Design a protein around this ligand. Structure first.
Ligand SMILES: CC(=O)[C@H]1CC[C@H]2[C@@H]3CCC4=CC(=O)CC[C@]4(C)[C@H]3CC[C@]12C
Length: 260
């Protein structure tokens, strides 16, 4: 007589959150690097900024379909993306470096791979070495794609306003759920000692991104404010993001969340 509103088939066929993360992972983006131009800081940095703007367009499309993110107030979704963008892009850079070059180079894009020489020419050498160190860590830990996709969501949820989000409870719920995903993901089959040791390594890695990202942002805000004198160009997307972030971070309104 009445139509069952529950779908057994639907629940059974719905993919796990981890499988969804794999399904929504953005496709690789090209930098549009032109080797006919000289490899001076002005050109390399402008090209990386253009690449960043293209990558952020895809990050936003990804965030729209990230399981759980839609549950947070809109204002909070926008805020987390703005506070975490540098952590997401630098972590993804190490991932590509790890997968495409065994962490021997920094794989910004298929058409723009930095070797030591480009790192020096970029005038961002020490920062490049810092992102490279994360890539090297991926090799030591043999980071898996599943672990990486969960950690990336955790990074999106790693920095919040000192004040607070519109819904701290909604945020905590999502953050706790994804930490649970990582927790289960590192569970072996049966060996708590090894399982906790790896969870510790992964969370220590996540934590280490805050100091790296702070240094990346210091340099970013610096080149941004002196873009005219330095001739470093930024695409509309980055001007929007940085114009919002710079004052908030510099006034002490960004609060990093740590595991340790
Ligand atoms: C121009 C500048 O200040 C540099 C310093 C840190 C650099 C960013 C470092 C992380 C990064 C990784 C990418 O894969 C795309 C470009 C970005 C997002 C870089 C764009 C250029 C930045 C913002």
């Amino acid at each position: 007589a009445l139509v069952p509103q529950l779908s057994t088939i639907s629940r059974a066929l719905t993919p796990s959150p981890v499988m969804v993360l794999e399904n929504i992972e953005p496709e690789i983006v090209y930098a549009g690097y032109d080797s006919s131009k000289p490899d001076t800081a002005e050109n390399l940095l402008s090209t990386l900024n253009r690449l960043a703007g293209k990558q952020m367009i895809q990050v936003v499309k990804w965030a729209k379909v990230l399981p759980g993110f839609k549950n947070l107030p809109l204002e909070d979704q926008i805020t987390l993306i703005q506070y975490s963008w540098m952590s997401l892009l630098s972590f993804a850079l190490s991932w590509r470096s790890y997968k495409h070059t065994n962490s021997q180079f920094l794989y910004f894009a298929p058409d723009l791979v930095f070797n030591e020489e480009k790192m020096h020419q970029s005038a961002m050498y020490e920062l490049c070495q810092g992102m490279h160190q994360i890539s090297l860590q991926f090799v030591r830990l043999q980071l898996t794609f599943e672990e990486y996709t969960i950690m990336k969501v955790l990074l999106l949820l790693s920095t919040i306003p000192k004040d607070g989000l519109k819904s701290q409870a909604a945020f905590e719920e999502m953050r706790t759920n994804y930490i649970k995903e990582l927790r289960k993901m590192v569970t072996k089959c049966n060996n708590s000692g090894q399982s906790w040791q790896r969870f510790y390594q992964l969370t220590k890695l996540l934590d280490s991104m805050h100091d790296l990202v702070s240094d990346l942002l210091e340099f970013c805000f610096y080149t941004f404010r002196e873009s005219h004198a330095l001739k470093v160009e930024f695409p509309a997307m980055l001007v929007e993001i940085i114009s919002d972030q710079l004052p908030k971070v510099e006034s002490g309104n960004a609060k990093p969340l740590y595991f340790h």
